[PDB]
Write an enzyme that holds these catalytic residues in place. Structure first.
Site, PDB file in Angstrom:
ATOM      1  N   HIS B  41     -17.449 -27.861 -31.970  1.00  0.00           N
ATOM      2  CA  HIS B  41     -16.265 -27.414 -32.712  1.00  0.00           C
ATOM      3  C   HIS B  41     -16.586 -26.989 -34.176  1.00  0.00           C
ATOM      4  CE1 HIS B  41     -15.300 -31.036 -35.065  1.00  0.00           C
ATOM      5  NE2 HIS B  41     -15.452 -31.784 -33.972  1.00  0.00           N
ATOM      6  N   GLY B 143     -14.440 -35.156 -41.995  1.00  0.00           N
ATOM      7  CA  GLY B 143     -15.824 -34.933 -42.393  1.00  0.00           C
ATOM      8  C   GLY B 143     -16.809 -35.850 -41.686  1.00  0.00           C
ATOM      9  N   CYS B 145     -17.108 -36.069 -38.361  1.00  0.00           N
ATOM     10  CA  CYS B 145     -17.556 -35.451 -37.109  1.00  0.00           C
ATOM     11  C   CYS B 145     -19.059 -35.261 -37.074  1.00  0.00           C
ATOM     12  CB  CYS B 145     -16.830 -34.133 -36.874  1.00  0.00           C
ATOM     13  SG  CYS B 145     -15.088 -34.334 -36.461  1.00  0.00           S
TER      14      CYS B 145
HETATM   15  O1  LIG Z   1      -5.229 -32.013 -36.243  1.00  0.00           O
HETATM   16  C1  LIG Z   1      -6.018 -32.422 -37.096  1.00  0.00           C
HETATM   17  N1  LIG Z   1      -5.715 -33.257 -38.092  1.00  0.00           N
HETATM   18  C2  LIG Z   1      -6.776 -33.432 -39.072  1.00  0.00           C
HETATM   19  C3  LIG Z   1      -7.650 -32.184 -38.857  1.00  0.00           C
HETATM   20  C4  LIG Z   1      -7.404 -31.862 -37.377  1.00  0.00           C
HETATM   21  N2  LIG Z   1      -8.442 -32.230 -36.383  1.00  0.00           N
HETATM   22  C5  LIG Z   1      -8.195 -31.602 -35.077  1.00  0.00           C
HETATM   23  C6  LIG Z   1      -9.326 -31.760 -34.085  1.00  0.00           C
HETATM   24  C7  LIG Z   1      -9.110 -31.445 -32.745  1.00  0.00           C
HETATM   25  C8  LIG Z   1     -10.138 -31.504 -31.824  1.00  0.00           C
HETATM   26  C9  LIG Z   1     -11.398 -31.854 -32.251  1.00  0.00           C
HETATM   27 CL1  LIG Z   1     -12.681 -32.002 -31.085  1.00  0.00          CL
HETATM   28  C10 LIG Z   1     -11.655 -32.162 -33.572  1.00  0.00           C
HETATM   29  C11 LIG Z   1     -10.609 -32.152 -34.495  1.00  0.00           C
HETATM   30  C12 LIG Z   1     -10.822 -32.612 -35.924  1.00  0.00           C
HETATM   31  C13 LIG Z   1     -10.649 -34.128 -36.046  1.00  0.00           C
HETATM   32  O2  LIG Z   1      -9.973 -34.778 -35.246  1.00  0.00           O
HETATM   33  N3  LIG Z   1     -11.302 -34.688 -37.094  1.00  0.00           N
HETATM   34  C14 LIG Z   1     -11.389 -36.056 -37.430  1.00  0.00           C
HETATM   35  C15 LIG Z   1     -12.272 -36.948 -36.819  1.00  0.00           C
HETATM   36  N4  LIG Z   1     -12.321 -38.267 -37.053  1.00  0.00           N
HETATM   37  C16 LIG Z   1     -11.461 -38.766 -37.931  1.00  0.00           C
HETATM   38  C17 LIG Z   1     -10.510 -37.995 -38.641  1.00  0.00           C
HETATM   39  C18 LIG Z   1      -9.609 -38.551 -39.585  1.00  0.00           C
HETATM   40  C19 LIG Z   1      -8.733 -37.753 -40.261  1.00  0.00           C
HETATM   41  C20 LIG Z   1      -8.704 -36.384 -40.035  1.00  0.00           C
HETATM   42  C21 LIG Z   1      -9.546 -35.811 -39.124  1.00  0.00           C
HETATM   43  C22 LIG Z   1     -10.476 -36.593 -38.395  1.00  0.00           C
HETATM   44  C23 LIG Z   1      -9.808 -31.931 -36.839  1.00  0.00           C
END
Ligand SMILES: O=C1NCC[C@H]1N1Cc2ccc(Cl)cc2[C@H](C(=O)Nc2cncc3ccccc23)C1
Ligand SMILES: [Cl-]
EC number: 3.4.19.12
Lengths: 298, 305
Positions: B41, B143, B145
């Site tokens: 991603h 950050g 990931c």
């Molecule tokens: O909807 C979202 N809300 C924040 C950004 C976004 N994320 C959607 C998403 C969807 C699919 C995939 Cl594979 C990666 C991701 C990413 C993800 O979850 N990152 C994280 C990963 N770990 C802990 C986090 C804590 C806090 C913010 C992000 C975090 C980005």
């Protein structure tokens, strides 16, 4: 999201662990520059009388599969300092710091100069640490990392009859009223680190756990009268000032959170948990909470 | 004496963490030999995340679009390929700090250490377990990931997890090092939820044996149970079924303490019925399930107190 008991990355300390053998005793040493630091009990003990009878070649120091040559030795309080011929090429930027009760640190538990695990813990108000150590763990060290500098704050020496642990700073001064000998010693009655429980309640609010909040406030004096009843350490104005940043972030004044802690102490959790715990957690300082809820790197 | 949630020393993994940047996205990579592994991603935009076609997004990229940074040194990307949900970036320098390693896929109930990283820089280490619902209860911010899960039994690092995303409940989802997700999750911002979670029964039993080894026996009783009767009771408290494999696995701890597995199962049934009554077990007022039978034998003494 999430809140874990988190230790500092141990790599800078792993590159310093060595095995020290003297006669039949084997324990761990910390190799920094051309000196190896270890508990003096490796040698009613009169340690200066026991040390004068030793020569450099009696101390076997092993760094990985390499034998280090001991070229000198001296004692500083309860730590033995073994001068070696080779400076540790993996020596990090470091400081020897003495911590106060309530402060937390990471422990790299070692056996035979080999690191086996890393955990986070706190210096209890009774100066003991609730660690996890077996025979061979003596010489294992406690540390924090500030930027790129490793601050060494603890060296393990012994276990007390209750299963808790005692040790020194890196200058050989014990934490607590302990001595390094086979004698009757006991940890004093322990207390809860109040400023740390409050910081952990702020961490719970930041992670979306607010069931314990209430509309009430308290005076510092009334809180301390109540806290003294439950074996909690007194909360000082310094602790209140230290909790300022977390109070500003969440919108809950430190004394407003004290009223929550007072209600938790007089009434319990009532089948509920806070951050996955049914007990009030006191091994996260205000700085640990800010660091884990901000992602500071090393 | 003592019982702590203990992580493996992280040094061997710290020497592998790098920062991977593609356009506006920055995350962590794992540099082993001349390959940098990271979540695929990293090639997405936040828009792309609903229904990304990774094959279509990857074909449009060249090696020079991927910026890899190891400390203060820029690594040169000389190739790229996708394997399931992991992107593999071939680089022109082998990592001189590459430890002896293996890629292992773990099962629910297994524990591992996580080295949480931001911008290719390690910030902390903690111990956790793969939940029965395939999620992990971690501590991860934006950050993180690309941060990895591992075990270091002997001197070999077994990589078992790479962090990909956070679910709406605050729990985390990720893949093994071959890019296969744990659980029914996808690297898409589609409506996904963790299934109802359960307690890892074999781990709670192992932790009760650890308490007996450390001198605590207040919770034991004179009763035994059949495996079937234990499972009928355990299911009512959202505990995972205990299989005959779990019973066999607990054999060594049963022999050390002198308490039969089904006798320990009877103490567990009673604990679930009565609670703790103001008491604790190894400093905890809850039944702990993130220590496997193997963790208990590794940490605890061979002589019962
Ligand atoms: O909807 C979202 N809300 C924040 C950004 C976004 N994320 C959607 C998403 C969807 C699919 C995939 Cl594979 C990666 C991701 C990413 C993800 O979850 N990152 C994280 C990963 N770990 C802990 C986090 C804590 C806090 C913010 C992000 C975090 C980005
Ligand atoms: Cl497994």
């Amino acid at each position: 999201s999430g809140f874990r008991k988190m230790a500092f990355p141990s790599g800078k300390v792993e590159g310093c662990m060595v095995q020290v053998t003297c006669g039949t005793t084997t324990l761990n040493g910390l190799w920094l520059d051309d000196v190896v630091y270890c508990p003096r009990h490796v040698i009613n003990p009169n340690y200066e009388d026991l040390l004068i009878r030793k020569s450099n070649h009696n101390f076997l120091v092993q760094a990985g599969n390499v034998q280090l040559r001991v070229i000198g030795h001296s004692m500083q309080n309860c730590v033995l300092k073994l001068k070696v011929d080779t400076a540790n090429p993996k020596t990090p930027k470091y400081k020897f710091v003495r911590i106060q009760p309530g402060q937390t640190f990471s422990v790299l538990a070692c056996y035979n100069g080999s690191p086996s695990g890393v955990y986070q813990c706190a210096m209890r108000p009774n100066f003991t640490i609730k660690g996890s150590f077996l025979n061979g763990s003596c010489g294992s060290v406690g540390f924090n990392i500030d930027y790129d500098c490793v601050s060494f704050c603890y060296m393990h020496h012994m276990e007390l009859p209750t299963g808790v642990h005692a040790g020194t700073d890196l200058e050989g001064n014990f934490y607590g009223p302990f001595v390094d000998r086979q004698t009757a010693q006991a940890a004093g009655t322990d207390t809860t680190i109040t400023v740390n429980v409050l910081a952990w309640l702020y961490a719970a609010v930041i992670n979306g756990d607010r069931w314990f909040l209430n509309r009430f406030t308290t005076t510092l004096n009334d809180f301390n009268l109540v806290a003294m009843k439950y074996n909690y350490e007194p909360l000082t104005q310094d602790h209140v000032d230290i909790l300022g940043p977390l109070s500003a972030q969440t919108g809950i004044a430190v004394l407003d959170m004290c009223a929550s802690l007072k209600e938790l102490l007089q009434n319990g959790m009532n089948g509920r948990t806070i951050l996955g715990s049914a007990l009030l957690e006191d091994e996260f300082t205000p700085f640990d909470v800010v660091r884990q809820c901000s992602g500071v790197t090393f």
